[PDB]
């Protein structure tokens, strides 16, 4: 009931809630990050898992934005989890492809709820 849409690998970070200025690593090494379409819920999600620890389970809505802050790093806010996720990539192209997929998914999310 869940189809993978796009898969990449990145280092995952979350912004420190107190200072809002520091990145806390949410994974020791790089982890798999995937976009999924949830056929049961008619929604798109970003899912990253490190064994039995679910690091990212972000449902993507049209309002959410992925902001690139370097050639290899970008971030998006997830109000449901009350956090900001950052992803660090080993090549600039992986960041670009992730950002482009993110924008694609935002419109799919809005078109899917029409």
């Amino acid at each position: 009931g869940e189809q993978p849409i796009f898969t990449t690998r990145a280092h995952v970070f979350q912004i420190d809630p107190s200072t809002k200025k520091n990145w806390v690593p949410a994974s020791k090494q790089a982890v798999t990050v995937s976009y999924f379409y949830d056929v049961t819920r008619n929604s798109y999600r970003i899912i990253s898992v490190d064994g039995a620890k679910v690091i990212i389970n972000s449902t993507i809505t049209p309002n959410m934005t992925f902001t690139k802050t370097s050639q290899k790093f970008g971030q998006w806010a997830d109000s449901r989890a009350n956090t900001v996720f950052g992803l660090g990539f080993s090549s600039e192209l992986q960041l670009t492809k992730f950002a482009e997929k993110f924008q694609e998914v935002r419109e799919a999310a809005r078109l899917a709820r029409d």
Binding site: F13, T69, F73, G86, G88
Partner: peptide, 19 residues
């Protein structure tokens, strides 16, 4: 709020060079 008045710097490993 989760809003940023200023965007945060990326982690030092993933920053763009400056110079």
């Amino acid at each position: 709020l989760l809003n940023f008045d200023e965007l945060p710097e990326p982690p030092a490993t993933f920053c763009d060079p400056e110079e």
